[PDB]
């Protein structure tokens, strides 16, 4: 389902790791814990 992105997309995710979804055939991210957003751009802020 999820496969390693190509290296050319190294900096796309800002706080996480690029992931490649075969069905969608588009790139997304696995965000480091604490971050969110399509590109993991935002520190998730808590109470």
């Amino acid at each position: 389902s999820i496969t390693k992105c190509s290296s050319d997309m190294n900096g796309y995710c800002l706080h996480g790791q690029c992931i490649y979804l075969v069905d969608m055939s588009q790139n997304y991210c696995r965000c480091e814990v604490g971050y969110t957003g399509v590109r993991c751009e935002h520190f998730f802020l808590t109470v």
Partner: protein, 500 residues
């Protein structure tokens, strides 16, 4: 009382840490949620994880993205309406995609037996082998007749554990096994004389034009859900006006039932920090010649005598709709701004540069442009800052943050993860609404000397000033407020830094 509410999520198919982290955040977002202001995204939920907390969701204002779940049952049993105020992939208000396991087995039950209306947008179903009974649904009754061309649905189940619809179900349509899962029809089954939703086949069964999913009676107070504005117990096309013209008097007459327009609600009063218009609506900004100033403790909008002073739009709206951060490209559009109409974002990507948006790296010198800013109508988000600088020098003249918009719907000031030693916000005097969070600034030292309560204007405002440089460390290194100013704290080590 009133509907419980959650913010929603716009992550699409991005995963938030591990499957466990992801699931947790999801639950934290939608536990006891009734209305979703944004988008309901259910992704990567694994087998046997309990999703019972979704049962309380009744309406989603944005889109609903159910994707990449191996869990068997997603019980959105009370979801009545998907408004489609925002689309997934430019065309769909409901997208169910690729909910299957490597073993080919995944999402099987999706019993949305109350989903009876989708205001805007089309629908997309794809790659759900384990799914049962959804192909039997007639979406002509649910989806608006303007988006039937755009719908793209195909159901192919070879796992084949699915049951047949209860005979009671009409036209063999059902969301599940029992009769209660038989689809409710409330639009295509109506008498020729119903402009809107109907309770049944007869003409007396029509609903009020303002009912959205259906009704339990003919009046506007009988709506299952409101199509536009919720006014107390009633659905209304427009919020009742403050004043109604009088034919006999020939002069305006006040309306007791009159109310103000705020979101999808008609309220007795606007929040203090929102602009109240003459015609009776709560707004975030002034339009065209109209400019912002408060006549009597209430922000009012009055036309400029001449050409209006320049308006500087905030990151995330206007020409900066999909800008992630003030950056090298856009900063020159903030040159002599005295007020930001919106929000400000400063992220590390700004100083690195981003090839994906074609943005070169921001020269930190350029940030001095922001020293003219005295006001911010929304929130202020700082997740990066020139590493060589020790305080937020560019905001030394910032006085007000109004918090009309709020980060994650909660924070009006968020400074996190900086190598600075002091905030340095000497001129900051009011934070009208929204919470405050300073954490992760490993070298910051003076933030807890201030009494943040003085800055607050709205009840409920609270702080999270944690996980910076510890106070013991600061005191040991000589980093406490100056001696001259010893009462109310300080924004730095120097005398000028101190409050009042």
């Amino acid at each position: 009382e009133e509907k419980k509410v959650c913010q929603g999520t716009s992550n699409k198919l991005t995963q938030l840490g591990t499957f466990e982290d992801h699931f947790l955040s999801l639950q934290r977002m939608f536990n006891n949620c009734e209305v979703v202001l944004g988008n309901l995204e259910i992704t990567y939920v694994q087998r046997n994880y309990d999703l019972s907390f979704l049962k309380t969701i009744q309406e989603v204002a944005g889109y609903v993205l159910i994707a990449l779940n191996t869990v068997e049952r997603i019980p959105l049993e009370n979801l009545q309406i998907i408004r489609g105020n925002m689309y997934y992939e430019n065309s769909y208000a409901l997208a169910v995609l690729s909910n299957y396991d490597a073993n080919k087995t995944g999402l099987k039950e999706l019993p949305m037996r109350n989903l009876q209306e989708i205001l805007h947008g089309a629908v997309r179903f794809s790659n759900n082998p384990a799914l049962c009974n959804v192909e039997s649904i007639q979406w002509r009754d649910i989806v608006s007749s303007d988006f039937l061309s755009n719908m793209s649905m195909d159901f192919q189940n070879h796992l084949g554990s699915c049951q047949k619809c209860d005979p009671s179900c009409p036209n063999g349509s059902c969301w599940g096994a029992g009769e209660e899962n038989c689809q409710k029809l409330t639009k295509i089954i109506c008498a020729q004389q119903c402009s809107g939703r109907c309770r049944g086949k007869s003409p007396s069964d029509c609903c009020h034009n303002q009912c959205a999913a259906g009704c339990t009676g003919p009046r506007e107070s009988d709506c299952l859900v409101c199509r536009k504005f919720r006014d107390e117990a009633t659905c209304k096309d427009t919020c009742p006006p403050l004043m109604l013209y009088n034919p006999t008097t020939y002069q305006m007459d006040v309306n007791p039932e009159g109310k103000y327009s705020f979101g999808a609600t008609c309220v007795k009063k606007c929040p203090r920090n929102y602009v109240v218009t003459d015609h009776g609506s709560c707004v975030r900004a002034c339009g065209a010649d109209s400019y912002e100033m408060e006549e009597d403790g209430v922000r009012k909008c009055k036309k400029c005598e001449g050409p209006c002073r320049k308006v500087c739009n905030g990151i995330g709206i206007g020409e900066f709709k999909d800008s992630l951060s003030i950056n090298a490209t856009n900063i020159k559009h903030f040159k002599n701004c005295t007020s930001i109409s919106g929000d400000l974002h400063i992220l590390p990507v700004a100083f690195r540069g981003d090839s994906f948006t074609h943005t070169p790296p921001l020269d930190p010198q350029e940030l001095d442009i922001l020293k003219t800013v005295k006001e911010i109508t929304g929130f202020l988000l700082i997740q990066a800052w020139p590493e060589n600088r020790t305080d937020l020098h560019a905001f030394e003249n910032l006085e007000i943050i109004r918090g009309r918009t709020k980060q994650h719907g909660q924070f009006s000031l968020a400074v996190v993860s900086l190598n600075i030693t002091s905030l340095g916000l000497r001129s900051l005097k009011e934070i009208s609404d929204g919470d405050v969070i300073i954490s992760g600034n490993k070298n910051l030292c003076y933030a807890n000397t201030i009494n943040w309560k003085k800055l607050f204007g709205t009840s409920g405002q609270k702080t999270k000033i944690i996980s910076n440089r510890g106070e013991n460390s600061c005191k040991a290194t000589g980093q406490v407020c100056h001696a001259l100013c010893s009462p109310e704290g300080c924004w730095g080590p120097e005398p000028r830094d101190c409050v009042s």
